[PDB]
Design a protein around this ligand. Sequence first.
Ligand SMILES: NC(=O)C1=CN([C@@H]2O[C@H](COP(=O)(O)OP(=O)(O)OC[C@H]3O[C@@H](n4cnc5c(N)ncnc54)[C@H](O)[C@@H]3O)[C@@H](O)[C@H]2O)C=CC1
Ligand SMILES: NC(=O)C1=CN([C@@H]2O[C@H](COP(=O)(O)OP(=O)(O)OC[C@H]3O[C@@H](n4cnc5c(N)ncnc54)[C@H](O)[C@@H]3O)[C@@H](O)[C@H]2O)C=CC1
Ligand SMILES: NC(=O)C1=CN([C@@H]2O[C@H](COP(=O)(O)OP(=O)(O)OC[C@H]3O[C@@H](n4cnc5c(N)ncnc54)[C@H](O)[C@@H]3O)[C@@H](O)[C@H]2O)C=CC1
Ligand SMILES: O=C(O)C1(C(=O)O)CC1
Ligand SMILES: O=C(O)C1(C(=O)O)CC1
Ligand SMILES: O=C(O)C1(C(=O)O)CC1
Ligand SMILES: O=C(O)C1(C(=O)O)CC1
Ligand SMILES: [Mg+2]
Ligand SMILES: [Mg+2]
Ligand SMILES: [Mg+2]
Ligand SMILES: [Mg+2]
Ligand SMILES: [Mg+2]
Ligand SMILES: [Mg+2]
Ligand SMILES: [Mg+2]
Ligand SMILES: [Mg+2]
Lengths: 328, 328, 328, 328
Amino acid sequence: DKTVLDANLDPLKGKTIGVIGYGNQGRVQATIMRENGLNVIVGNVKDKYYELAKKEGFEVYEIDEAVRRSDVALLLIPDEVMKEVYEKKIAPVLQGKKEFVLDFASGYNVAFGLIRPPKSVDTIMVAPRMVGEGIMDLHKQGKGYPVLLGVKQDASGKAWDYAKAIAKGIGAIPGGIAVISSFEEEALLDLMSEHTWVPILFGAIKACYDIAVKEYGVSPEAALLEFYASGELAEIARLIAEEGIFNQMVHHSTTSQYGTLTRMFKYYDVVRRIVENEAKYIWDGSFAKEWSLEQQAGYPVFYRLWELATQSEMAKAEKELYKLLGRK
Amino acid sequence: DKTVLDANLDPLKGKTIGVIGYGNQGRVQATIMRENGLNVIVGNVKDKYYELAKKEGFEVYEIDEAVRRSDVALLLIPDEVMKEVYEKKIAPVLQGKKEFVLDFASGYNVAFGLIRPPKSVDTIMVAPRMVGEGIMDLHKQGKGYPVLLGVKQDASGKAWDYAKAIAKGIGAIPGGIAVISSFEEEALLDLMSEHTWVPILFGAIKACYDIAVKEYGVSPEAALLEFYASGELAEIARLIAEEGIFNQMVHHSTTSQYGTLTRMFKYYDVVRRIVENEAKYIWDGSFAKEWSLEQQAGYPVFYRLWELATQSEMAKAEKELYKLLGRK
Amino acid sequence: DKTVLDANLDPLKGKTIGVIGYGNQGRVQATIMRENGLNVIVGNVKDKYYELAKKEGFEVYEIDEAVRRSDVALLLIPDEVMKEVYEKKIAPVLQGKKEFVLDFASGYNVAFGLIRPPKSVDTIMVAPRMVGEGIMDLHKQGKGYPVLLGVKQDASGKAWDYAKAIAKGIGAIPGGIAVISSFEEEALLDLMSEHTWVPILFGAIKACYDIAVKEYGVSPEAALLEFYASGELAEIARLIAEEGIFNQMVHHSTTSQYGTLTRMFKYYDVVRRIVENEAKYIWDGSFAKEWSLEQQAGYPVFYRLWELATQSEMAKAEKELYKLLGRK
Amino acid sequence: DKTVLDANLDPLKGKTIGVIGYGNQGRVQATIMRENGLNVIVGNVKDKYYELAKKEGFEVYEIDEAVRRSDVALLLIPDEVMKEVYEKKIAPVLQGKKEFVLDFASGYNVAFGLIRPPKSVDTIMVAPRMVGEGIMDLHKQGKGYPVLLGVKQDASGKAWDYAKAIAKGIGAIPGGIAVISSFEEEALLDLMSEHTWVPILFGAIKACYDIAVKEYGVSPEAALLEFYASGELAEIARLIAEEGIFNQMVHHSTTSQYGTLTRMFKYYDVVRRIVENEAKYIWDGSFAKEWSLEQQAGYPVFYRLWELATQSEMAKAEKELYKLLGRK
Ligand SMILES: NC(=O)C1=CN([C@@H]2O[C@H](COP(=O)(O)OP(=O)(O)OC[C@H]3O[C@@H](n4cnc5c(N)ncnc54)[C@H](O)[C@@H]3O)[C@@H](O)[C@H]2O)C=CC1
Ligand SMILES: NC(=O)C1=CN([C@@H]2O[C@H](COP(=O)(O)OP(=O)(O)OC[C@H]3O[C@@H](n4cnc5c(N)ncnc54)[C@H](O)[C@@H]3O)[C@@H](O)[C@H]2O)C=CC1
Ligand SMILES: NC(=O)C1=CN([C@@H]2O[C@H](COP(=O)(O)OP(=O)(O)OC[C@H]3O[C@@H](n4cnc5c(N)ncnc54)[C@H](O)[C@@H]3O)[C@@H](O)[C@H]2O)C=CC1
Ligand SMILES: O=C(O)C1(C(=O)O)CC1
Ligand SMILES: O=C(O)C1(C(=O)O)CC1
Ligand SMILES: O=C(O)C1(C(=O)O)CC1
Ligand SMILES: O=C(O)C1(C(=O)O)CC1
Ligand SMILES: [Mg+2]
Ligand SMILES: [Mg+2]
Ligand SMILES: [Mg+2]
Ligand SMILES: [Mg+2]
Ligand SMILES: [Mg+2]
Ligand SMILES: [Mg+2]
Ligand SMILES: [Mg+2]
Ligand SMILES: [Mg+2]
């Protein structure tokens, strides 16, 4: 009832498009927009990404120059830095424009009140559900992916059509779909995913390895092969996406079904408590504070935790093994 | 140091192979063994799988007949029923043989002392790391998968070569590898996987859905798209298998990296406790008892939990959605 | 809205009826069905109940013979044994029939997946709300009782009429009523009753006796007379059924009303917790496992608990007293 | 095995040395380097320390000028501010140099990823084990002190010799020794000292004073004399450094030995727990965040805690007393 499976592309036509930030997402999205008959110019600071963009047949102007030239702008730089960059390079140029469309790939900065623009511009959002490195793949298979879109500020009365045209232009639909929502919901959901069932999974795997090796005298090779060094999880996830999370298990053994179901219904309350805590922590705005301050300090915790993860026993063993298998 | 990347196939040659149980694994393995120039006959009870095997150009004899004819037998029926079936249909025919090789796809029945054969036969094990429905795929891509192999009883002094020839014959190597271990370790690892980080993941996802819908007024469609209805997890898992569990995250956003790492190191002790409890429960032999009794009663808990899972709100919503997307 | 107060009886007419199990319920139901112009034959194993049935003018055939002869069958044997008896004596004869109606007095075996029949038969349920020894009584007063009915499998499109005709035939309606429901609900409710407020009541009575005697120097006779050896509870329960559980108390003293209400609202949370625990334990299917295994072991706990109950002080005292009063 | 007791000094010769920050450490180290035939110029902002350096026969250039002139630079300013100062005054001048040696007196900024230089420079560390005011003393006694040294980045293949020459040049060896380590270990150790057994000691002393005065009616003078106003602790610490922490106690009374040992082995677990917590807090990088943010806010907690410490009863009493004794 709140979905789209295809839409138009023409309101983009004639206009000029500016993709600020040629990284994980800017690279892919700009490439596809080019392939869809949309002349896109890139705006980036002077670094290696500048070299790259300039090297892939892109007119890499400076940010403000791009905004000047462009009627549509895509703010594809980290969720952590498009505030310093906003009022210092965009908001001024914005006081000059009157017809301008501004897009995000997330609701972080705006849902938490870090970027509040004026009544002159159209303020939208369109967010994929991939990592970018997994979008090149689907595009090379004539496929599409899902997205979420939402609008905060309707200056021209035409927001939704612009959003849907963008969706079609970057390669989401046709082939996938898109749903309408707020910014709050998008932010909440992305962060719940990033905070609840990803880290829990990783910690459980790590704990299984540690235990099996240090209390049951197992060989690292076998542990790694069983837990994640094999492509089992990938096939399971594909079957989940194709058939259903539960129906999928009809391809497992009954032993697996039974153990999984029992232990799932056995541990539900604990993870429920955890999810409650984290979703509350987010809904308030505490995490955004935590994170912006982590920047302003210089990313110390970031650094140390990367180090601790890559200097763990499991990671060294994985190094040796992946070496053995020729995997890079 | 404990690995193989290719081996021979000839000791299989001349002999006859019997695949008892033409299901998830028997189907695939028998098919591939056929394709590798190994004449395989199938042994199964009279049901739909009998129809299937007989229909795919297989000489579907009765079990005992297959054992008679066969010099090698593969016991690919559920981990729950190859005891009634063992002494009643195999052990007698076995008292007649003297040169016979017997294979398992797991160490459950033998590690826990439910099947102890006599000194006359070779008792091995060879176990994949896939669900079967995900092996047809890799075989249709000229690829291989990992396995684990181990031997309990060496009657002919030639166990390991037989095991490795089987590995090569069913399609594991070349393309993947195989490692040697006990039966205890294999069982422990498979069950730890099936009991710790799969059900935890599923329960966390379910809890996220429930919370987001019942305490923050979210639309089911968006929740499902974010959490699992999208193919994000599949791409993440592929990148994990390819590059590494941590290095993979270099393709994410820094926000995701930070939240994930923090919450991973924050909740490690809890999941560690859980894994300890479950691994202990297994190492003792309690779960095998639990499970065999669940059979002998008639699978009541099994039934009820399937019902509860498929009659939850999330599953109905997924039904509607997958319908909308054309997914079956 | 989901009720019936009378219905037809003719679809039963012409057909033959088989009552498998001539015990607490089979005796009574078969007797009444006879009295309602329904020729019923009995099917039972060779024991004292066989003698009884054969002695009360019943054609006591063997089970399979009864099923052959019969177009309708009633499975009135314990909830614990109609699985061994099902596939070994019924399911085979069933593969031969195509028009056959099968009835239960409970949803235990089918709700938990211990008996799943084929698409050929009509699978219903009709369950009273009495103990059998209390139905002879009401029938000897031209009265009726309540029941619950539900159907799992509609093979002929006529289930409900068959169920209602059976209800009318055994003596429920007219005089009482009947309601439609699932099997799950019936099972849940019967077991909640049998697990929550019956045993709690008995334990409270026993504790009152023990305390009054061992800490306040009371005579056993008086304790027994007050608590249950008197017919007070019977009259209270009759008034409850007639007027209402609360309105009834208008015939008590105000002292009783006050104490009862206060202590009821005072202890509600505790019993609520207990009921939650037990209903959960049931909804999962754990109790069915517990119980089937108790059989397969040989009913040890059953035996020991009967012994402990009949060898308690209260029971001996009740023996002496009931002897004094001439009560058997 | 990882120690040095003397080394060379010549690689310093010919080069020019720049000491950025003429404070607690820069003053002392620069003075000694002068005395060792090493021409050192000072780089500092315009304040009283500028006056001082310029007044002690130092060419006090501006920071960038010093870096230009200098082939070796010592970054002896607070651990809290050499980031603003780094990229704004050093990193630019650094892009011009190719042969440059850069030294720290600690591993804080670099171990936590607040300062990551380019592959062009040599990045070392050399850290004393004194407070500076206690180094002038030992140098005026022809003695030396210990240090720790470590290198993060070897651009010229000559790091260690440079580090050891610096050690010899500032007055550590000969007379003391030096050990090699990472940056992580140095940081961890310094901070563990500053967080565990210093503050615990001070709090215990304060508590003893408070208790003795407010619950046993003692005179402040006596409490202060016993606990710290006497030079007992100094002599104890000297004997510890000379003989050993335990052997030292052979000069105490047996009463003291007994009480000390008993209560030491009695309270070990508690302090162990505390040390665990704090070392973990550090290893993650949380404290560095805490501290950099304390700066960015304006040092409020710092200020308030100084006030609370100097406005406590004990401090006023110490004021009066030290006045009485002529101590300043
Ligand atoms: N795969 C992913 O990482 C996903 C990202 N998104 C969203 O899209 C946005 C892009 O995220 P990523 O590209 O992955 O992060 P990223 O780390 O790859 O960002 C790199 C880009 O940001 C630019 N940049 C970096 N620092 C800058 C600075 N101080 N000033 C100006 N420009 C700077 C650089 O030019 C570079 O091109 C995020 O905001 C996120 O909300 C949504 C879907 C998934
Ligand atoms: N994808 C999977 O399920 C995996 C299975 N394995 C191992 O391989 C074995 C096969 O597991 P699955 O094929 O998935 O289970 P399954 O449920 O698919 O087993 C079905 C097969 O078992 C036969 N069978 C069933 N009941 C029987 C009975 N009472 N008497 C005689 N035969 C009966 C049937 O002929 C049928 O062909 C398991 O023991 C497991 O340890 C190892 C890797 C993954
Ligand atoms: N540095 C210290 O130990 C301090 C000691 N005090 C007080 O002064 C007193 C002396 O303490 P310390 O000399 O350090 O102990 P200590 O262990 O050095 O005592 C040794 C002396 O005690 C004599 N002695 C030992 N056992 C004896 C015995 N059974 N019978 C007769 N004489 C015996 C010996 O002749 C020897 O000279 C203590 O009571 C203490 O309260 C006060 C300030 C500090
Ligand atoms: O490989 C495994 O872990 C599975 C099993 O049932 O043993 C398929 C799920
Ligand atoms: O950083 C994000 O937002 C990701 C998401 O889509 O959840 C890629 C990981
Ligand atoms: O006999 C009793 O227990 C009653 C009383 O009020 O005393 C009638 C209820
Ligand atoms: O002065 C004290 O505290 C000492 C004693 O034993 O009394 C020397 C240690
Ligand atoms: Mg995100
Ligand atoms: Mg996401
Ligand atoms: Mg398994
Ligand atoms: Mg497995
Ligand atoms: Mg009952
Ligand atoms: Mg009942
Ligand atoms: Mg120090
Ligand atoms: Mg003393």
